[PDB]
Design brief:
part of a larger assembly; 11 chains; A mainly alpha (about 350); B mainly alpha (about 120); C mainly alpha (about 55); D alpha/beta (about 325); E mainly alpha (about 60); F mainly alpha (about 100); G mainly alpha (about 50); H mainly alpha (about 100); I mainly alpha (about 25); J mainly alpha (about 450); K mainly alpha (about 50); F: about 100 residues; mainly alpha; Helix Hairpins; 3 helices; about 70% helix; about 0% strand; H: about 100 residues; 2 helices; elongated; binds cardiolipin; binds 1,2-diacyl-SN-glycero-3-phosphocholine; binds 1,2-Distearoyl-sn-glycerophosphoethanolamine; binds guanosine-5'-triphosphate; electron transport; In-situ; NADH-ubiquinone oxidoreductase chain 2; EC 7.1.1.2; NADH dehydrogenase [ubiquinone] 1 subunit C2
Chain lengths: ~350, ~120, ~55, ~325, ~60, ~100, ~50, ~100, ~25, ~450, ~50
């Protein structure tokens, strides 16, 4: 891809997301979604392998189904209310239909099998983009319309995302798949906290965005895609694996690392809303995420693995890609807990 | 909680009124800790690039801590303003609704019948 | 004797002592923020000394 | 600024600098078949620069002072052990072949970067496409196991396809018995201990897969020993061939950008040279890898990033 | 230091933390009330602004 | 809540069911998607024409505008699956399962 | 809107089409202009939770 | 065995090179200096001086104050004949009994 | 010498999934 | 407490930049001055807890444990450079950093004022211990050890977090002083029963209670020596300390649900002790003995009697010292033999007379020979339990009996016999370990002389 | 010297270094000026002094 073309496509993805997060008209929000979908496929197809074609397809048809469903909801709302403004749904059917219409975009419900597939098929950089930037728009729409959600549906969605993500992550050695399942689990956390206080949803989303950025760019700088290849990084470059394990402990949410602050704050919120079984359930089932986080950490830094002799030349040559914002990203990824009350800035 | 409060103007850090609050002190432990994050970010940056993490690129580390402190100051001012707004909306709503905030006819422990549990 | 090497070797040592002094300074600069009840507890509520204008620093 | 996406956005192309004289050549042949001689002759006759045949320490030449690092630190294998004791459980032979493959890979990478950056043509002694002749010739001689051969093929497919074949390649045809006599007269005791069947197998593997599959990728120039003796005629042959075969013509500036991106990142080039396959002569143990990496770190100029090591004579590190 | 040190320090700490505690309780109750009724500065929800409405005489008289 | 709306909504429902079920090909699913789009256009047009929301008649046009764009992108995806696969069927599209 | 840039810049991008009572071309009234106008003028600034 | 591994290093005892080894590190001078610092700080100023500290704190739990007020009120109550302690720790008169 | 992972320990999860079944197959 | 926090934090740069040879010396000496500074913290007001600031306070329960940790920190430093000699300087510096971060987290835990902050640092002790156990471990199931330890701790930790935030919403604050002064009676509601279970089971997991105690025979047995002693000596005390803090707002319900767990410990302390008798490894035997002693501390906690609390605190301190010393002795013998079965090297009393002694009073203190603080801490709990219920005594009376058996059994089977002829690597006793057991033993008898300090807040 | 080729950062870039210090001093004196403006403005807001 011509670099200018790639820049324009990225700008169009960002412009679609911005149009979603700044427009009041429902049609304009859908137009932003459409621009995002339209510009996302070539980014995946950048490397042009059959894996990329497979993943880009599976991405497309799911998103297209979700967007058409979103139109069905918008049109029903207009029919029953006569308003395009993004305030609240005046027809229960329209909203209990858009809840999953906006869900396949996030990929949390049983509408989640597409996420690991697309993540594994496409390249790692576009995987970072898909798992970080492609979630602000539907989450923004959900935040705007959170006033009129059916809490039972949204909470069931969040529970299923958490449970299946944590369980599926236990049975993959490819980094892209277990990161997709981790993203599903974090989607479940944020979507669970969504109906009560959207500020905690924003805080968890920001923490997840920065921390997944740090994790993925560490993966890119390590040039690893399978567990064995990542384990081999210790001989060539040990500081990457050392930061890997700390960032994985943050993935699991072990305090005093940054990853606890959302998991903590979310639990503080819904227990204020008389919800006690749900926070305990999520707190216990995050251990499934933690298990494969520690499995990845064990065979990356905590136990040095059989290396390859040709790495004698690999140590001889340094890196060239700068990986901008990485050292800052690790810092906000591990130690921001003492500045927890700063979440009031979001509110 | 406050995204729907009347009078809010979107997309601007401090809404002018916040200057009536005491600005956070430059010594503030929250601010200096955010400066510490600036130092740490320099350490990883040198370590991430195979550099003498302590002595390499003094300017780069110096830029890191300075940048963190500046955004640290504005975040702290923004942080304190919201908490001040939370208290303002609280007490104003408390005064505006006396019936929903009853007062308690204060009495001492000598008249409270607090049951005692024999610890056996 | 190469006293510059002496200081370069022995400047590891000063960190904990200066940290101790700083810690003492700080938790001294942690009671002046809690003078809300100086000579106000009824048990120790005594008069204010003519030459000593506070009960505790 | 080094060439990146920003340079293409700015307008830094490479079809502009690349001309007809910008050629990448490899002069290939049997052992001591005069390939280095003829490569040098075509080099300074056509005006093109010359990178010598990549060996164990060519990569050692690329980085730092260029002195050949310790054999243990630089791939713990020696050509002398190959020549003296061919069949042993330590498997120095396949380690030799793999390290030579990766060294020639980086040699071709630098060569491609050269004529895609400054436009000056490049000449070489053998390359990746002639690298397999050795490994197959050895394997046919009861030398290495087929698992090593399959690891070699899997590394070749995933670390050679991203590169593109040369412009022209010259073959110096010297008969194998003449090669045996030449090694007799050479004098080095290690090359005495050679199987003539191995030399005939090198010749066979050359003109059975290398030259045939070459002919469909670029233009081949088979010269006999006497024919390649008169270098003027071979250089005037390579001048007038057609220079119109292979993927070189149908090579847009965007694929030029791709190949420059690939060559400029050496860690990318040899990223798949260390794929996890766990071969008996390839897995350096955890303890051995730890100690050897520490030894490489204590070696001067290999502890910090190139240009930051204070022990070697750098300066301004504290504002660098 | 003397016992009065700890006595007055504990007075200040206890007063400050008790104020924090019942302020938190008041926060919870106020949030519940304002979310339930909406007659307060926060928890307001967006509604269509009236200035968008056009009052000029249309083609149909009894619009 | 009148009658024609029932028929258009029901047509959209069957088109949603048809999209969410594949049999062999990729073109058929895309056709079912554009049928969903057709039902959406007819429904929205009916709604806005009935309500005399004159400023909103552009909305079905923009619907069709992005409709054609998605159809084009989907069939280019099918072009690539045919180029790397010879055919367009989806059951043989399984290389990403592991 | 999530990040209402329109009110910040005072620029109209989609608010003209949001409601049926807005300034339509050639002053064509909506079918239910009067009811929409009354409902909108009723619950303006009162709050989206008090409106119901 | 498919894994190039060095032989396990022998368990190297410290005494073979300097017999005076204190079991701290290889170099005798820094080994000995670590000896001096531990045998100084662990025992002299922490074990001994610390024991003088803990044996000689100021008033602990005000037990001496407890005794020196205790015999005072025993003197008072036993002299005046009042029971030396009251079955109630708080005056029943000021306590308003329910119902 | 503490146990450092060897080849057979590495292969315990290096491929497909680390929980192999008949569904994993090949 | 920043007169102890700030120097501990600033101890990190010293090791992290010290030379290749000075890290051990500098860390040891400056940790010794840190312990000296924390020795002051034994200064305790009669009844008022020393409230240094809003977020930091100490009383007669937190201060002895804090002094124990600070005095302990040089001991891992002295016990580690034997098995850490052949390592890169950066790796050694990080091992030291893990130890300092562990001690720092323990100090903030013991001096914390709000229950949520206590939970934060209490659990946050997991990470440095996890790194120590996993990376620097030498045995096989160290990787399994880390998983078992982390998951066992967290499975109780998270419900505790939910209970604490619920308490904050309901009561108003998690501050210890508020929840004690403004304490309210707890009704026998089943939701309150589950709240009590959430507030109790985390600490009882780290106690450990019988049954869910499998993380110690699979964690302490595997960790490097420094990790092993910091685990057994203090990290076990975390649950007891937390329970002592939390039973203020857990009454009068406790008694009704005290019945299952109490006897679960009371019976359990027998089985563990029996498991000690038929052991094969020294470290496993010490771990099971630690489980039994901590179960006795559990019983002391759930009696909720003043005497029970004082005996509990004394037992925590004495058990920490004794377990650390026993683990150090086991490491010395194991390193000398490079194996851990307690049959490979026996009859070493003659070869190493000072080790023979160190083992003798290590066993004696483990056996609770009076008037050592171990014996008085045990006996106070025994008397409190007898006051609560008489029959307890026989079970109690069984324990030390079986304890005494194994308390001498290993000493009989490791030094009190005939040496093994084929082994010869047992060299002269390096004075490092002998000195280390000295710094273990003399404070034990010193505190025996004046047990009013380790007696707890009830004294 | 050691490296046959010139190093990527061997001789430091006077340019980027110059901007680094130039922006850092900017951030510092803007921070100070802002703090003084806030403290004086807060003093005159509620009429404290
Ligand atoms: C929240 C708060 C914290 C987070 C704040 C934001 C952090 C952003 C981090 C950016 C990291 C960039 C990076 O290293 O990318 C490497 C990676 C490519 O690494 P590579 O494979 O070594 O690059 C090879 C070249 O791309 C090969 O290039 P080529 O030759 O094919 O030509 C294309 C080239 C063209 O490049 C140029 O023209 C220059 O493209 C690029 O260079 C890629 C970057 C383009 C950036 C355009 C920015 C426009 C504004 O690029 C990306 O991942 C780009 C993703 C899209 C932008 C980043 C979005 C991440 C954050 C999303 C959430 C934001 C916050 C939401 C709340
Ligand atoms: C450290 C640990 C905790 C980290 C917490 C997050 C810190 C980083 C995020 C805060 C700073 C950046 C976002 C805030 C900002 O600049 O504008 C917010 C927003 C932007 O305008 P806005 O509020 O109209 O749009 C964003 C909408 N919400 C808040 C729902 C996400 O607010 C303001 O700028 C002030 C006016 C509106 C106030 C509400
Ligand atoms: C017989 C006793 C012999 C003692 C010999 C010295 C070694 C044992 C004492 C160690 C003292 C450690 C510091 C201490 O207790 O308090 C810190 C002490 C006191 O800490 P501080 O300064 O915060 O105490 C506040 C009260 N004033 C300011 C009046 C002292 O540190 C210093 O004095 C400096
Ligand atoms: C808690 C954090 C640490 C948790 C344990 C980390 C993994 C286990 C330790 C060994 C990792 C492997 C290794 O080689 O470690 C040393 C490595 C740098 O090694 P080296 O290149 O020799 O350093 C030269 C410095 N001038 O350097 C490192 O590993 C650095 C470790 C940094 C850890 C993250 C710190 C974040 C901020 C707090
Ligand atoms: C108060 C300021 C403290 C810091 C500045 C002063 C430092 C010295 C403090 C007093 C020391 C008195 C005894 C000095 C003995 C010196 C022996 C010696 O020279 O050892 C040097 C050596 C390291 O090698 P090198 O330095 O190169 O010298 C040998 C070259 N062939 O071998 C070595 O082992 C190095 C020296 C041994 C280590 C000495 C202990 C260092 C720390 C001592 C103080 C600890 C307490 C600090 C706080 C006190 C107040 C509370
Ligand atoms: N195993 C192995 N050895 C190789 C390979 N390429 C080159 N070598 C060795 O590198 C040296 C190449 O020598 P040649 O160039 O054939 O002959 P020469 O004696 O240098 O003389 P000229 O051909 O005239 O330069 C010999 O030791 C080869 O065995 C390869 O792919 N594999």
């Amino acid at each position: 891809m011509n670099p200018i073309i790639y820049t324009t496509l990225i700008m169009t993805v960002m412009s679609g997301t911005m149009l979603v997060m700044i427009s009041s008209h429902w049609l304009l929000i859908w137009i932003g979604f459409e621009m995002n979908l339209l510009a996302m496929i070539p980014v995946l197809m950048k490397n042009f392998n059959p894996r990329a074609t497979e993943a880009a397809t599976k991405y497309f048809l799911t998103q297209a189904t979700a967007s058409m469903m979103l139109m069905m909801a918008i049109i029903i709302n207009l029919l029953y209310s006569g308003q395009w403004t993004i305030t609240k749904m005046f027809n229960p059917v329209a909203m209990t239909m858009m809840t999953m219409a906006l869900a396949m975009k996030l990929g949390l419900s049983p509408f989640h099998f597409w996420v690991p597939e697309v993540t594994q098929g496409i390249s790692l950089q576009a995987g970072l983009l898909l798992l970080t930037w492609q979630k602000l728009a539907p989450l923004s729409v959900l935040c705007q319309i959170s006033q009129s959600i059916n809490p039972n549906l949204m909470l069931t969605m969040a529970m299923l995302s958490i449970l299946i993500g944590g369980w599926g992550g236990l049975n993959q050695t490819q980094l892209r798949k277990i990161m997709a399942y981790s993203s599903i689990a974090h989607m479940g956390w944020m979507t669970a906290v969504l109906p009560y206080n959207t500020t905690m949803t924003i805080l968890n989303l920001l923490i997840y965005i920065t921390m997944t950025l740090a994790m993925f760019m560490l993966l890119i700088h390590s040039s690893a895609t399978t567990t064995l290849s990542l384990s081999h990084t210790w001989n060539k470059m040990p500081v990457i694996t050392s930061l890997m394990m700390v960032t994985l402990l943050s993935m699991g949410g072990l305090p005093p690392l940054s990853g606890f602050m959302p998991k903590w704050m979310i639990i503080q919120e819904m227990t204020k809303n008389e919800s006690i079984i749900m926070p305990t359930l999520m707190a216990m089932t995050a251990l499934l995420n933690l298990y494969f986080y520690m499995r990845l950490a064990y065979s990356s830094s905590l136990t040095m693995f059989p290396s390859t002799n040709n790495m004698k030349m690999k140590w001889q040559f340094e890196h060239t890609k700068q990986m901008k914002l990485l050292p800052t990203m690790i810092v906000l990824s591990t130690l921001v807990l003492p500045m927890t009350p700063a979440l009031s800035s979001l509110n | 909680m406050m995204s729907g409060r009347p009078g809010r103007v979107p997309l601007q850090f401090l809404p002018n009124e916040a200057r009536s609050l005491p600005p956070p002190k430059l010594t503030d432990p929250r601010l200096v800790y955010m400066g510490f994050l600036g130092y740490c970010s320099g350490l990883i940056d040198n370590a991430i690039r195979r550099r003498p993490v302590v002595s390499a690129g003094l300017h780069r580390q110096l830029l890191y801590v300075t940048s963190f402190v500046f955004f640290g100051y504005y975040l702290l001012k923004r942080q304190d303003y919201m908490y001040a707004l939370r208290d303002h909306d609280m007490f104003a709503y408390v005064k505006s609704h006396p019936e929903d905030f009853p007062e308690k006819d204060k009495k001492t422990y000598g008249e409270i019948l607090e049951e005692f549990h024999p610890v056996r | 004797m190469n006293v510059l090497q002496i200081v370069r070797d022995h400047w590891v040592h000063i960190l904990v002592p200066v940290g101790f002094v700083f810690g003492c300074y700080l938790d001294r600069r942690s009671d002046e923020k809690l003078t809300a009840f100086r000579n106000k507890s009824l048990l120790f509520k005594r008069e204010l000394r003519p030459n000593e204008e506070v009960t505790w620093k | 600024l080094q060439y990146g996406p920003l340079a293409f956005v700015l307008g830094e192309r490479t079809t502009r600098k690349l001309t007809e004289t910008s050629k990448v050549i490899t002069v290939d042949g049997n052992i001591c078949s005069g390939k280095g001689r003829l490569a040098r002759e075509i080099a300074e006759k056509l005006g093109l620069r010359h990178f010598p045949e990549a060996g164990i320490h060519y990569a050692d030449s690329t980085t730092g002072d260029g002195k050949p690092l310790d054999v243990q630190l630089s791939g713990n294998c020696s050509l002398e052990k190959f020549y003296d004791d061919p069949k042993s459980n330590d498997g120095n032979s396949y380690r030799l072949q793999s390290w030579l493959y990766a060294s020639r890979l980086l040699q071709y990478a630098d060569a491609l970067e050269h004529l895609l950056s400054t436009g000056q043509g490049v000449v070489l002694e053998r390359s990746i496409y002639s690298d397999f002749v050795f490994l197959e010739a050895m394997y046919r001689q009861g030398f290495i196991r087929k698992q090593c051969v399959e690891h070699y093929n899997e590394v070749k497919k995933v670390t050679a396809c991203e590169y593109l074949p040369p412009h022209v390649v010259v073959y110096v045809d010297v008969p194998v018995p003449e090669i045996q006599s030449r090694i007799q007269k050479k004098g080095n005791p290690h090359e005495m201990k050679i199987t003539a069947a191995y030399l005939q197998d090198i010749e066979n593997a050359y003109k059975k897969t290398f030259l045939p599959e070459m002919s469909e990728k670029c233009e081949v120039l088979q010269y006999s020993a006497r024919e390649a003796e008169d270098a003027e005629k071979v250089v005037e042959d390579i001048e007038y061939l057609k220079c119109d075969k292979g993927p070189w013509p149908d090579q847009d500036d965007r694929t030029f950008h791709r190949l420059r991106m690939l060559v400029q990142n050496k860690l990318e080039v040899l990223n798949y040279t260390t794929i996890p396959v766990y071969l008996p002569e390839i897995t350096i143990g955890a303890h051995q890898s730890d100690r050897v990496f520490q030894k490489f770190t204590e070696l001067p100029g290999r502890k910090y990033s190139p240009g930051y090591n204070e022990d070697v004579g750098d300066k301004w590190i504290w504002l660098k | 230091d003397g016992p009065e040190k700890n006595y007055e320090k504990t007075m200040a700490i206890l007063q400050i933390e008790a104020e924090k505690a019942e302020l938190r309780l008041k926060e919870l109750e106020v949030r519940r009330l304002m979310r339930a009724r909406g007659d307060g500065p926060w928890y307001q929800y967006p509604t269509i602004d009236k200035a968008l409405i056009d009052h000029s005489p249309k083609t149909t008289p009894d619009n | 809540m009148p009658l024609v709306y029932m028929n258009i909504i029901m047509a959209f429902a069957i088109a949603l069911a048809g999209l969410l079920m594949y049999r062999s090909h990729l073109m058929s699913s895309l056709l079912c998607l554009e049928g969903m789009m057709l039902s959406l256009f007819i429904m929205s047009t009916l709604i806005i024409l009935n309500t005399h929301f004159t400023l909103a008649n552009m909305m079905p046009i923009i619907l069709l505008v992005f409709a054609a764009c998605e159809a084009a992108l989907g069939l280019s995806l099918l072009v690539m699956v045919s180029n790397t696969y010879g055919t367009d069927y989806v059951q043989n599209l399984n290389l990403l399962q592991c | 809107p999530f990040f209402d840039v329109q009110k910040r810049l005072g620029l109209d991008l989609d608010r003209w089409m949001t409601i049926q009572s807005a300034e339509q071309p050639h002053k064509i009234p909506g079918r239910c202009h009067a009811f929409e106008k009354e409902w909108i003028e009723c619950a303006h600034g009162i709050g989206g939770i008090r409106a119901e | 065995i498919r894994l190039q591994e060095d032989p396990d290093p022998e368990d190297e005892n410290l005494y073979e090179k300097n017999p005076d080894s204190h079991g701290y590190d290889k170099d005798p001078i820094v080994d000995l200096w670590n000896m001096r610092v531990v045998f100084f700080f662990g025992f002299s100023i922490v074990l001994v001086l610390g024991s003088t500290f803990v044996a000689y704190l100021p008033d602990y739990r005000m037990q001496e104050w407890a005794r020196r007020e205790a015999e005072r009120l025993v003197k008072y109550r036993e002299a005046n004949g009042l029971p030396l302690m009251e079955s109630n720790c708080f005056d029943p008169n000021k306590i308003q009994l329910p119902e | 010498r503490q146990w450092q992972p060897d080849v057979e320990w590495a292969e315990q999860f290096g491929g497909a999934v680390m929980y192999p079944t008949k569904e994993t197959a090949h | 407490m920043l007169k102890i926090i700030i120097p501990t934090t600033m101890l990190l740069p010293m090791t992290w930049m010290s030379k290749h040879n000075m890290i051990w010396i500098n860390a040891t000496v400056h940790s010794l001055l840190i312990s000296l500074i924390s020795l002051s913290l034994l200064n305790q007001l009669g009844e008022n807890s020393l409230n240094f600031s809003l977020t930091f306070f100490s009383d007669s329960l937190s201060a002895p444990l804090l002094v124990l940790t600070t005095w302990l920190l040089p001991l891992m430093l002295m016990a580690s450079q034997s098995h850490l000699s052949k390592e890169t300087t950066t790796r050694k510096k990080l091992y030291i950093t893990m130890l300092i971060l562990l001690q720092l987290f323990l100090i903030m835990t013991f001096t914390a004022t709000e229950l949520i902050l206590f939970y934060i640092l209490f659990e946050a002790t997991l990470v440095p211990t996890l790194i120590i156990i996993t990376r620097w471990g030498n045995q096989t199931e160290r990787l399994n050890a880390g998983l078992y330890f982390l998951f066992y701790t967290l499975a109780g930790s998270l419900p505790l977090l939910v209970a604490l935030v619920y308490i904050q919403n309901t009561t108003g604050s998690l501050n210890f002083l508020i929840i004690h002064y403004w304490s309210h009676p707890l009704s026998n509601s089943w939701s309150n029963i589950f709240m009590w279970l959430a507030c109790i089971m985390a600490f009882m997991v780290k106690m450990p209670l019988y049954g869910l105690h499998l993380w110690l025979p699979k964690a302490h047995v595997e960790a490097p020596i420094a990790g092993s002693m910091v685990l057994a000596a203090v990290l076990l005390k975390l649950g007891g300390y937390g329970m002592m803090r939390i039973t203020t707002i857990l009454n009068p319900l406790t008694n009704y649900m005290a019945y299952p767990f109490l006897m679960l410990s009371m019976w359990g302390m027998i089985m563990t002790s029996s498991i000690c008798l038929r052991q094969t490894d020294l470290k496993s035997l010490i771990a099971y003995s630690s489980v039994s002693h901590m179960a006795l501390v559990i019983v002391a906690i759930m009696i909720q009697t003043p005497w029970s609390f004082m005996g509990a605190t004394a037992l925590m301190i004495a058990h920490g010292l004794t377990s650390s010393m026993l683990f150090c002795l086991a490491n010395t013998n194991y390193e000398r033999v490079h194996s851990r079965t307690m049959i490979l090297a026996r009859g070493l009393q003659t070869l190493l007379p000072l080790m023979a002694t160190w083992w003798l009073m290590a066993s004696l203190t483990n056996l609770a020979l009076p008037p050592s603080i171990n014996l008085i801490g045990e006996l106070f709990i025994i008397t409190a339990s007898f006051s609560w219920s008489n029959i307890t005594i026989i079970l109690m009376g069984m324990n030390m009996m079986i304890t005494a058996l194994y308390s001498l059994y290993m000493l009989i089977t490791t030094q009190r016999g005939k040496y093994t002829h084929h082994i010869n690597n047992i060299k002269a006793s390096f004075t490092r370990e002998n000195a280390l057991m000295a710094l273990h033993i003399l404070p034990l008898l010193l505190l025996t002389l004046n047990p009013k300090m380790i007696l707890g807040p009830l004294y | 010297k050691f490296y046959i080729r010139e190093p990527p950062h061997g001789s430091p870039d006077w340019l980027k270094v110059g901007l680094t210090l130039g922006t850092s001093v900017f951030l510092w004196i803007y921070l100070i000026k802002q703090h003084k403006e806030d403290v004086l403005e807060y003093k005159r807001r509620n009429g404290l002094e």
